[PDB]
Amino acid sequence: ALKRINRELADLGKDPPSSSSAGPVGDDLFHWQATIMGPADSPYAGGVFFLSIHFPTDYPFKPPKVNFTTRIYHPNINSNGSICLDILRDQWSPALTISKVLLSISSLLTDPNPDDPLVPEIAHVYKTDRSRYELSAREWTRKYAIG
């Protein structure tokens, strides 16, 4: 619990995550506000996405509840920020750090998985009209994830 959360906070403190940046909200160790930078080789290039993490008591057992705050046009992310991620579902298995999660999420943002989508309309647009999906993603990441 508090000691694991702190070992991780110190790890991130020393080993620079570079792309990401996680830290406690105010002084509460069970509520973090993380930042993710849009991959260069993706429609979300040049974007800053804020995520809220709510560590659970059982942690490192139970999975960290992670929700997007910035609006994003992604097949696996809905309007409330929920993320369709496998690591948070049944591959969590306390063993990884809060830099693994953010790496996974950076790669999910790099390339979506439309075969098991969470937003069917966006997945349909991605599968059928790729160019329109790219334009919509760029518009959304320019309107919300910048400034």
């Binding site: 369709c84 991620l85 496998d86 579902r89 049944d90 998985n113 098991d116």
Partner: protein
């Protein structure tokens, strides 16, 4: 030798392999033919699930054996 891999939809794929070939090589061939990542390939023969790091001979796979390929759906 030659082997047959049956999919979930009833399709049969014929492969040219050797008894000494590793499971990884077979999964690579299946990815090359069908595009299925090895991590999502679950090959089963005679009620036993093929595991990475072993060879066909380890599973007593012989001439014209039949395997079954099921996908490991992600979330």
């Amino acid at each position: 030798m030659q082997i047959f891999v049956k999919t979930l939809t009833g399709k049969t794929i014929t492969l040219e392999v050797e008894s000494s070939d590793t499971i990884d090589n077979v999964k690579s061939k299946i990815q090359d033919k069908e595009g299925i990542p090895p991590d999502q390939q679950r090959l089963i023969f005679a009620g036993k699930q093929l595991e990475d790091g072993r060879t066909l001979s380890d599973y007593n796979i012989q001439k014209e054996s039949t395997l079954h390929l099921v996908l490991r759906l992600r979330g």
